[PDB]
PDB file of C-alpha atoms (C1' of nucleotides) in Angstrom:
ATOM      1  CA  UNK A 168     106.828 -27.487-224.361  1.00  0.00           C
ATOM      2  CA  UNK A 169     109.572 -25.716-222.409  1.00  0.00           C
ATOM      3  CA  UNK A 170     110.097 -22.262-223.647  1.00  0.00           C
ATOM      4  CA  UNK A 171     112.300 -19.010-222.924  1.00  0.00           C
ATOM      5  CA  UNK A 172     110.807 -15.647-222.838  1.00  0.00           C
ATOM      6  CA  UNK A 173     112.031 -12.215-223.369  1.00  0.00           C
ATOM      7  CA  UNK A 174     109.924  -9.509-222.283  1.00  0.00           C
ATOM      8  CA  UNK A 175     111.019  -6.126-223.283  1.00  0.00           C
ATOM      9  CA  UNK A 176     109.510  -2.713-222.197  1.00  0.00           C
ATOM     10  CA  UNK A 177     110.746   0.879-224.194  1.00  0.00           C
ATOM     11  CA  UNK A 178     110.271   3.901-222.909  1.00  0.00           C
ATOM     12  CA  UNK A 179     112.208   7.622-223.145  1.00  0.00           C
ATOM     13  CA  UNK A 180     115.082   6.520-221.134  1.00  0.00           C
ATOM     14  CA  UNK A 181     114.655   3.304-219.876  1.00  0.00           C
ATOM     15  CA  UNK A 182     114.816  -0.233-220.869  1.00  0.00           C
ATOM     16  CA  UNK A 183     112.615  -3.043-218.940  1.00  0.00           C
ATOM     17  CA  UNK A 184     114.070  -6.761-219.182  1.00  0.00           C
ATOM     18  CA  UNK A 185     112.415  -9.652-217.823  1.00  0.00           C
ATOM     19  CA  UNK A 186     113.885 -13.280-219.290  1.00  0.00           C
ATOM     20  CA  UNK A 187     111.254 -16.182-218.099  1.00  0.00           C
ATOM     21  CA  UNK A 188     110.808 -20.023-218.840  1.00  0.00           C
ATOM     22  CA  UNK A 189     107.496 -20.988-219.253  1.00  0.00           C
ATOM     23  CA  UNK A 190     105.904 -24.086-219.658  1.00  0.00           C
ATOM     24  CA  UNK A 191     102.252 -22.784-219.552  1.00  0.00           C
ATOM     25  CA  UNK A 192     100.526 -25.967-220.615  1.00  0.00           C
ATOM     26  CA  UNK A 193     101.039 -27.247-217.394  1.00  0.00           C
ATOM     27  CA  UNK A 194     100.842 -24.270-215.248  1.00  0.00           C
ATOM     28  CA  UNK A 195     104.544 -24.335-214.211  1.00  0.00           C
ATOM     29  CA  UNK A 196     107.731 -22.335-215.027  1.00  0.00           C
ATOM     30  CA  UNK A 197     109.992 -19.657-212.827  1.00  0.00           C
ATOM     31  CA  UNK A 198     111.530 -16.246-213.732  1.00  0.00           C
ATOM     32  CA  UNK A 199     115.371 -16.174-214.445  1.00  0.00           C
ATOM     33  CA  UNK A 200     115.621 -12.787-214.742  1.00  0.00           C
ATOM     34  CA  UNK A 201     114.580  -8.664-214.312  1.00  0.00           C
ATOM     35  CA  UNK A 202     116.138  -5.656-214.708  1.00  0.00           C
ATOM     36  CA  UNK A 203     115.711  -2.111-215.737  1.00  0.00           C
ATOM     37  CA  UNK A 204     118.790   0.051-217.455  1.00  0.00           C
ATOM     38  CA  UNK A 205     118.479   3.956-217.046  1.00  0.00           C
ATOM     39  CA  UNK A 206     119.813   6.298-219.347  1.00  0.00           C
ATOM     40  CA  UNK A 207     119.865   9.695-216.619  1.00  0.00           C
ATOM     41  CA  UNK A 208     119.100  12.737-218.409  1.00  0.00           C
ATOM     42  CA  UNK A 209     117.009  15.822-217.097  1.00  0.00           C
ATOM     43  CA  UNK A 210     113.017  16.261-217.103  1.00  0.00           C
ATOM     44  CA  UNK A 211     113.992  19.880-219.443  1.00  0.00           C
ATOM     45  CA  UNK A 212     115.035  17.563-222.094  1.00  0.00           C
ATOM     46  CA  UNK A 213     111.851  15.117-220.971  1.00  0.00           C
ATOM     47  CA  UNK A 214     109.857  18.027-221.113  1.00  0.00           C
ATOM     48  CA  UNK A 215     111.573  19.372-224.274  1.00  0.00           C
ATOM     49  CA  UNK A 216     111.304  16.771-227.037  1.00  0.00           C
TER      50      UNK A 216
ATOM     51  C1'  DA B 254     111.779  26.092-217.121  1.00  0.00           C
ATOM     52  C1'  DG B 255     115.343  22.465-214.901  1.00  0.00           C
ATOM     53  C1'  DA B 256     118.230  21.181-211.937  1.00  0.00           C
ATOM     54  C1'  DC B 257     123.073  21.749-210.538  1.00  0.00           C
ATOM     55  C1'  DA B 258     126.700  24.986-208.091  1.00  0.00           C
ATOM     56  C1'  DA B 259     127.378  27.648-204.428  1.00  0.00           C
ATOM     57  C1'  DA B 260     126.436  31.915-201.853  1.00  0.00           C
ATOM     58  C1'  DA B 261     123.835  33.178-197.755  1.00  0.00           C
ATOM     59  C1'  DC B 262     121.697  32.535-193.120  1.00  0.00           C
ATOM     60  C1'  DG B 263     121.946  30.724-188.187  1.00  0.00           C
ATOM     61  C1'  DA B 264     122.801  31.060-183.599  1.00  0.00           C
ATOM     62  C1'  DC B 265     126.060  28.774-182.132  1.00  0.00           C
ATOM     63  C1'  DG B 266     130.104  27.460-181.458  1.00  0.00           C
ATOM     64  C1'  DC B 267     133.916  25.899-181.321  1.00  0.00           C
ATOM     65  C1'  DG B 268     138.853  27.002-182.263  1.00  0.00           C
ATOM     66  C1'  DT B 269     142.939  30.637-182.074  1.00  0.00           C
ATOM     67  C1'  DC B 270     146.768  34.476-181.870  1.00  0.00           C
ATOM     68  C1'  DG B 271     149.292  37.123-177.694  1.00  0.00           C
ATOM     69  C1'  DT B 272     149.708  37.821-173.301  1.00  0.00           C
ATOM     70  C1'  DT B 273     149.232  37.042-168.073  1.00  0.00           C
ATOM     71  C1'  DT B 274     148.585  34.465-164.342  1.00  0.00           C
ATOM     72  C1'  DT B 275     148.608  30.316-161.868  1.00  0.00           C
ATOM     73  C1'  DG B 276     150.487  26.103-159.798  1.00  0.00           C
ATOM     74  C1'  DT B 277     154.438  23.270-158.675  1.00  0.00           C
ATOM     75  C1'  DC B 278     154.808  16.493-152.605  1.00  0.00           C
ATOM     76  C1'  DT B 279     156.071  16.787-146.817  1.00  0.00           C
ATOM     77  C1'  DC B 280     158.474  15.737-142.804  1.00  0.00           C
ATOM     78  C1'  DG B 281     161.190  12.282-138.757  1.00  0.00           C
ATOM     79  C1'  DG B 282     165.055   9.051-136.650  1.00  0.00           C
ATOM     80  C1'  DC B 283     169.628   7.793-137.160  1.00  0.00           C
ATOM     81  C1'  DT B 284     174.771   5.182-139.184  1.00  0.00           C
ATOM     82  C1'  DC B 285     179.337   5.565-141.460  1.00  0.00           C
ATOM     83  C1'  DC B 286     182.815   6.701-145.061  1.00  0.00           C
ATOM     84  C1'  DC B 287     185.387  10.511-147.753  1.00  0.00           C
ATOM     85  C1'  DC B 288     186.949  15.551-148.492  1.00  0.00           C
ATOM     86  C1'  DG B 289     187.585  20.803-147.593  1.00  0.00           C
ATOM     87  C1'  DA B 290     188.993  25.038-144.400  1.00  0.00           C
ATOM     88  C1'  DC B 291     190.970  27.035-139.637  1.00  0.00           C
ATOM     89  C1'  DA B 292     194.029  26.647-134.766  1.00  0.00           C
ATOM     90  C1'  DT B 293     198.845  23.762-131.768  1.00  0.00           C
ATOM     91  C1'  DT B 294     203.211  20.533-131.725  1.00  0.00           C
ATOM     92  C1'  DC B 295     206.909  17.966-134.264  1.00  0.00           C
ATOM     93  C1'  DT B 296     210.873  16.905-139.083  1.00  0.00           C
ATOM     94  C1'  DC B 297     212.810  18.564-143.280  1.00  0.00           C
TER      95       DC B 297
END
DNA sequence: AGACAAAACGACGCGTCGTTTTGTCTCGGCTCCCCGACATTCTC
């Protein structure tokens, strides 16, 4: 009925985090919370791989 | 090729050593104490 949510998004050098608790049934529920860790490296090595 | 490290440019721009030159409160009235020197007399 009540449930927690971890939405994760990958990419090269990043990390997206979103934690939510829906309760979709009955249209309600909030965001806890949202993020996004970096991992700094140049566009060469972007370019690079 | 990327993106950091720093040299280069700018007119601008202000600091800096070594010396020279400049600027720096003013006058009025009195009173009463002391001392100094130089003349005379007098004592020793």
């Amino acid at each position: 009925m009540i449930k927690n949510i971890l939405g994760l998004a990958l990419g090269t050098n990043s990390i997206g985090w979103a934690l939510v608790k829906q309760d979709f049934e009955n249209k309600q529920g909030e965001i806890l919370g949202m993020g996004s860790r970096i991992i700094p490296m140049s566009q060469d090595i972007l370019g690079d791989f």
